[PDB]
């Protein structure tokens, strides 16, 4: 049973957690892997993660995660929000 | 293939051996010893001892005679050879003097057997097999008999009139017993080895042999029966069964069985591994494994 | 020699046995975005990420100075006044003030109130040992740092005694790890980093 | 000889002191009584002959919530409806929230039950004798738990978000329970002389 | 040593050889076997009760031959030995023992009743003997001196502890201690020593039971870092830490077999 947290009183920790970047890196390796909307000027790249890293660096990646409490509410976090 | 020794009991001990203490029993005297005529070797005996129960009684020995049944005191055996006087009987196990310490372990044995009390009774309690039988007393007396000859004791001698033999070896057996709760040596050591043998290729290819044997004169016994009825005309080669051990052999020594492909399912492990030429040093050091 | 050869048969397996047997049964646990190591079912085992609230990985065990001191020497260490000592002053260079108005003198023994509550408490708590293992080795930060800057006894402080007490009240208010507030849920954190913090005012007090 | 006279001067070690801890009132003289200084209150015919009146009552101080307990021995061994039920009406009569009643050695089933039942809202607690006669709360592995008000209980459930089954239970066969005197449903927060680094506060409830 | 030998099992351990049945008719039977007898006339001579409300009866002495060996390392004197036995019997037994003076140390327990009541569930007939043995069961078994039931033979290792000073410095207190060797405690604080707020145990089990649940869990984790620690071993407090709460952390100690 969901319940939504508010953008505005979010209380997890602000910083991108040693998981997270996994997952997201993951996450859009994927999708460019699969011919997808590329967000920063292409540097060069053939490997389709080297390039999700790149845009890491420069926090211009889309996805968002949503962080379940044991309450069962959650919270969503903007790659471009995180540390 | 190579046959592979082995290393069970020793037989013929004359092996204190106790344990502790779940616990039941408090000192055993295990003997598992029999013939040893070139073959046969079935048979087993151990006898108990009990001290706990602060409350029942004063510590009483028993025994069991495999392979029936449960446990019968001491007393009531030397009252089934030929020793039921009391006194007598006590000459058989210790000495006086004595050194009654030793002795009055005794007391709570014999208790044991007031009720015995002389030859009758004695064979009597003997009626537990077994699978449902008997009818009764007679009956009993005749399987107390047989067991007193083949089972008590199976070695030393088989025959008929040698029951006076027996009656030390038991004394012997419960003497060292008494050494040990009075704690006047030590239990003896099962690390030997030196008391263990090697069953090679000889002692092996014995038990085989006879456990295929005996079904030969009994695959024939039935041929004999179905002929002397409506058959008859006498014999001849016309039974005796080519593939009973040939066959019978091939896939005995073959695998690690000991009778297949019969039944016999867990029946030990050979002992029957293939030779192993890797290195001739090896071939060696495999020819001499147990 | 074939003992050892049968007590390395053993450890090959059993070894093996016993490590399952945890497995088994903490498998369940598992840190939640709480801050806090809960239960399959939710049920509860630590309210803090290890009683700690760090990660094991990044830890180095460290010393407190401030313990095993007599207290005739703590206050050579520590403490200051006005009674017949300025010592500071030789090295307040450049500039003294020359202790300007009250206010100063007043924030070094409020300092020393706490860094004070502190000797006692622990102990009062921890038997005598020192060596303790801590987040971030400090005792290093700071050198180096006396690399990194250098200045010897002969450049002497171009800081003030009213810094260095707010630098840490600001630093050691950075250190947060259970959010937020959200009141007296500031307490599980003011003492979740407790131990911590008597380190930052035992290595940088005044 | 007179071994077990001085045995019980130390129920008293582990009954005045049994308070606050809780939050009733005690005086601070009752807590400093040395050997004789509890003789001294007590006049026994000797040498031996103790009993009397060995048992009194307490005041608390957080005012409101009500009510107050009472402190009575036996002295005789062996209880006991026939000195159980009959020890009731006394708890009913001077009016208290709750009382103890002490004994040695064994209690018999038949006095257990035909008490707490008819009880209602008050409570019988709990220990005996050569048990606890000593207070366990004054031990190195021991940390100092404090009870919870039902408002600070509802806290925990708020910061923490759980469920009062979510939580750290504690068996009620526990010295501890039994001496702050828990009951089913209250949560106690303990101060843990952890490391940890820091101190630690963890919570329980009970079972 | 005043604790040392102030919770020990102690009973009937000193006798160890033993215990001896002899038949003597009259109240005045005896012979031996040794030298005493003539304690046992005095006793007789001061005639205070012989007769007493009852008379002549109990043909069923019993001796015991207290050793030397333990009367040393153990403060026991005769009277004590034989003084707490009938606090547990009623005067079922009439113990006469001798001065230090003696080469054996002996003392008697006769038996007396009839013309007693007799009765009832469970005849006797033949012979005097049984109701006896099992009597012994308990004698032996029962029990004065500070013999924490349960607790045998005890320890003394000087265990360097550390302590404060009002200097500030810390120093190493060489306190003795002892090492039991089974339990139980419980009673085992109500010692004079003690000590209550420090004393210690191997069994979780009863520390549940006597401390608290918090108490068990600083148990657990004593008892695992005593485990893997000596010697140089890879310890974290951390995951230490873990195992403890996930096994007090229900109330009841669930074990993790496999």
Same mark, same amino acid.
């Given at each position: ?83 | ?12 001990? $004359?092996? $204190? ?22 073959? +046969? ?20 020995? !028993? ?65 537990? /097999? ?9 009956? +009993?007396? !005749? ?32 003497? +060292? ?36 044997? /005996?079904?030969?004169? !009994? ?46 399912? $867990? ?24 | ?114 860094? =004070? ?45 009213? =810094? ?17 507030? =959200? ?24 | ?64 919530? %009500? ?14 409806? %026939? ?29 257990? %039950? ?74 106690? %927060? ?18 | ?124 007939? *033949? ?14 078994? #029962?029990? #004065? ?19 404060? *000073? ?16 089974? *339990? ?64 007090? #952390? ?9």
């Amino acid at each position: 049973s969901g319940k939504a947290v508010a953008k505005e009183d979010r209380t997890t920790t602000p910083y991108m957690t040693k998981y997270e970047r996994a997952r997201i890196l993951g996450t859009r390796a994927l999708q460019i892997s699969m011919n997808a909307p590329v967000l920063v000027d292409l540097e060069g790249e053939t490997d389709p993660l080297q390039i999700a890293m790149k845009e890491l660096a420069q926090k211009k990646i889309p996805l968002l995660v949503r962080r379940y409490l044991p309450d069962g509410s959650y919270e969503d976090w903007s790659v471009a929000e995180l540390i | 293939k190579v046959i592979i020794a082995q290393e069970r009991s020793a037989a013929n001990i $004359v092996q $204190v051996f106790k344990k502790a203490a779940p616990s039941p029993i408090a000192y055993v005297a295990e003997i598992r010893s029999a013939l040893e005529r070139g073959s +046969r070797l079935i048979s087993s005996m151990q006898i108990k001892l009990m001290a706990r129960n602060t409350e029942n009684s004063g510590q009483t020995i !028993r025994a069991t005679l495999p392979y029936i049944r449960s446990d019968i005191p001491i007393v009531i055996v030397f009252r089934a050879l030929g020793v039921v006087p009391d006194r007598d009987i006590l000459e058989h196990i210790c000495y006086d003097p004595n050194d009654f310490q030793m002795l009055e372990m005794m007391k709570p044995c014999i208790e044991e057997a007031f009720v015995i009390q002389d030859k009758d009774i004695a064979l009597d309690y003997i009626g537990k /097999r077994g699978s449902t039988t008997g009818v009764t007393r007679e009956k +009993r007396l !005749r399987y107390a008999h047989d067991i007193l000859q083949k089972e008590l004791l199976p070695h030393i001698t088989t025959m008929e009139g040698f029951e006076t033999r027996k009656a030390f070896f038991l004394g012997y057996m419960i003497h +060292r017993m008494l050494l040990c709760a009075l704690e006047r040596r030590e239990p003896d050591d099962r690390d030997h080895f030196g008391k263990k043998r090697l069953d090679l290729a000889g002692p092996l290819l014995a038990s085989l042999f006879r456990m295929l044997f /005996r079904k030969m004169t !009994r695959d024939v016994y039935k041929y004999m029966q179905k002929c002397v009825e409506t058959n008859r005309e006498f014999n001849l080669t016309l039974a005796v069964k080519s593939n009973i051990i040939t066959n019978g052999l091939r896939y005995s020594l073959a695998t690690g069985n000991w009778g297949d492909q019969k039944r016999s399912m $867990v029946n030990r492990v050979g002992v029957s591994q293939v030779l192993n030429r890797y290195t001739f040093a090896s071939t060696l050091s495999h020819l001499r494994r147990t | 020699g074939r003992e050892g050869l049968i007590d390395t048969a053993v450890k090959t397996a059993e070894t093996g046995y016993i490590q399952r047997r945890l497995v088994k049964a903490m498998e369940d646990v598992m840190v939640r975005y709480d801050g806090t190591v809960r239960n399959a079912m939710g049920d509860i085992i630590q309210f803090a990420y290890g009683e700690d609230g760090l990660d094991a990985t990044l830890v180095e065990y460290q010393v407190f100075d401030s313990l095993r001191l007599s207290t005739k020497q703590f206050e050579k260490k520590y403490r200051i006044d006005l009674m017949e000592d300025r010592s500071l002053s030789l090295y307040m260079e450049n500039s003294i003030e020359n202790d300007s108005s009250v206010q100063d003198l007043l924030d070094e023994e409020y300092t020393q109130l706490v860094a =004070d509550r502190e000797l006692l408490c622990k102990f009062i708590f921890p038997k005598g040992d020192a060596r303790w293992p801590l987040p971030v080795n400090v005792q290093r930060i700071i050198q180096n740092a006396l690399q990194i800057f250098h200045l010897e006894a002969k450049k002497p402080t171009d800081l003030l005694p009213s =810094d260095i007490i707010n630098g840490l009240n600001e630093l050691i208010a950075k250190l947060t790890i259970f959010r937020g507030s =959200d009141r007296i849920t500031r307490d599980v954190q003011n003492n979740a980093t407790l131990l911590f913090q008597i380190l930052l005012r035992s290595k940088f007090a005044v | 000889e007179e071994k077990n006279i001085v045995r019980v001067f130390r129920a008293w070690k582990t009954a005045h002191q049994l308070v606050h801890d809780r939050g009733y009132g005690v005086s601070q003289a009752e807590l400093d009584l040395t050997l004789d200084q509890f003789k001294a209150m007590h006049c026994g015919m000797g040498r031996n002959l103790d009993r009397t009146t060995l048992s009194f009552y307490a005041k608390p101080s957080n005012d409101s919530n %009500k009510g107050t307990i009472y402190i009575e021995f036996a002295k005789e061994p062996s209880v006991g409806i %026939k000195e159980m039920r009959t020890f009731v009406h006394t708890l009913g009569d001077h009016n208290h929230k709750t009382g103890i009643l002490i004994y040695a050695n064994s209690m018999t089933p038949s006095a257990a %039950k035909i008490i707490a039942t008819v009880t209602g809202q008050f409570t019988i607690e709990t220990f005996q004798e050569s048990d606890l006669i000593v207070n366990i709360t004054h031990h190195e592995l021991v940390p100092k738990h404090i009870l919870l008000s039902p408002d600070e209980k509802k806290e925990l459930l708020d910061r923490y978000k759980l469920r009062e089954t979510q939580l750290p239970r504690i068996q009620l066969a526990d010295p501890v329970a039994r001496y702050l005197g828990l009951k089913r449903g209250e949560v106690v %927060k303990i101060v843990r002389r952890s490391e940890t680094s820091g101190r630690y506060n963890s919570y329980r409830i009970c079972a | 040593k005043n604790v040392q030998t102030q919770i020990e099992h102690t009973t009937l351990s000193t006798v160890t050889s033993a215990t001896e049945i002899h038949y003597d008719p009259d109240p005045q039977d005896t012979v031996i076997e040794e030298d005493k007898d003539f304690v046992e006339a005095f006793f007789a001579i001061p005639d205070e009760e012989v007769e007493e409300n009852l008379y002549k009866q109990s043909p069923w002495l019993l001796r015991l031959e207290l050793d030397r060996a333990k009367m040393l390392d153990k403060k026991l004197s005769m009277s004590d030995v034989a003084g707490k036995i009938a606090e547990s019997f009623e005067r079922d037994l009439f113990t006469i023992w001798s001065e230090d003076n003696a080469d054996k140390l002996i003392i008697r327990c006769r038996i007396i009743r009839d013309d007693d009541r007799k009765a009832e569930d469970d005849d006797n007939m *033949i012979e005097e003997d049984v109701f006896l043995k099992t009597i012994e069961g308990h004698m032996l078994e #029962s029990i #004065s001196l500070r013999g924490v039931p349960n607790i045998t033979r005890v320890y003394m290792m000087e265990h360097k502890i550390v302590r404060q *000073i009002e200097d500030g410095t810390f120093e190493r207190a060489d306190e003795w201690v002892l090492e039991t060797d089974g *339990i139980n405690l419980t009673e085992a604080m109500t010692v004079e020593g003690v000590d209550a707020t420090r004393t210690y145990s191997n069994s979780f089990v009863e520390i549940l039971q006597i401390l608290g649940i918090e108490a068990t869990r600083s148990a657990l984790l004593k008892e695992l870092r005593n485990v893997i620690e000596f010697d140089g071993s890879y310890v974290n407090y951390r995951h230490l830490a873990l195992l403890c709460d996930v096994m007090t #952390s229900r109330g009841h100690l669930m074990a993790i077999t496999r």
